[PDB]
Amino acid sequence: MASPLDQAIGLLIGIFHKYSGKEGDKHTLSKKELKELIQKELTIGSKLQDAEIVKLMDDLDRNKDQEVNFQEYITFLGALAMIYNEALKG
Amino acid sequence: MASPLDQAIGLLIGIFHKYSGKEGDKHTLSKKELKELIQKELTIGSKLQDAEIVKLMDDLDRNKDQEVNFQEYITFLGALAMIYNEALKG
DSSP states (O other): OOHHHHHHHHHHHHHHHHHHHTTTOTTEEEHHHHHHHHHHHSOOSOGGGHHHHHHHHHHHHHTTTTEEEHHHHHHHHHHHHHHSHHHHHO | OOHHHHHHHHHHHHHHHHHHHHHOSOSEEEHHHHHHHHHHHSOOSOGGGHHHHHHHHHHHHTTTSSEEEHHHHHHHHHHHHHHTHHHHHO
16 A cells, blocks of 8 residues: 555646546646646735746646647646755655 | 645655655765665565566666666656556546
8 A cells, every 4th residue: 555645746746637527638738738737726815926937837838849748847836846955855 | 826736846855854864954865765764764675576666766877777766766756657557547
């Protein structure tokens, strides 16, 4: 078993595929579909930051030109975790 | 909402840093220490799979042979998730 981790990877996977659903995007997310993911999940409120969101979205989709592949999404969430370095350290 | 994702990434991050903490507060984690992570966290009853675990350990550490690095751990968990295709299908 690996229940504690399974639920967590499960979360990322669920969030992703819930979004892929939006346009049946297999195991991929299209660049603006990703923005929709972020806007929905990461409820910024301060939409002024959308500039940062589009830079981030570019960084996500760049890995496969116009879409984020599942593993690139995971990888990038890793990068995001690293950016949230406080989370890493404690 | 953010919190569902935040806790999930939090899970992976915590799991990592709990173990890297053993060597120090590093975003890097040694190969046998990774195995020690897996054995506790990914509590495989079927320990006969040990061979598979050390191949997996090799695949994790292979990023620089000596140790797993945080980003590569996340990316690899991405691969693991992809292998768990069932989860991605539903």
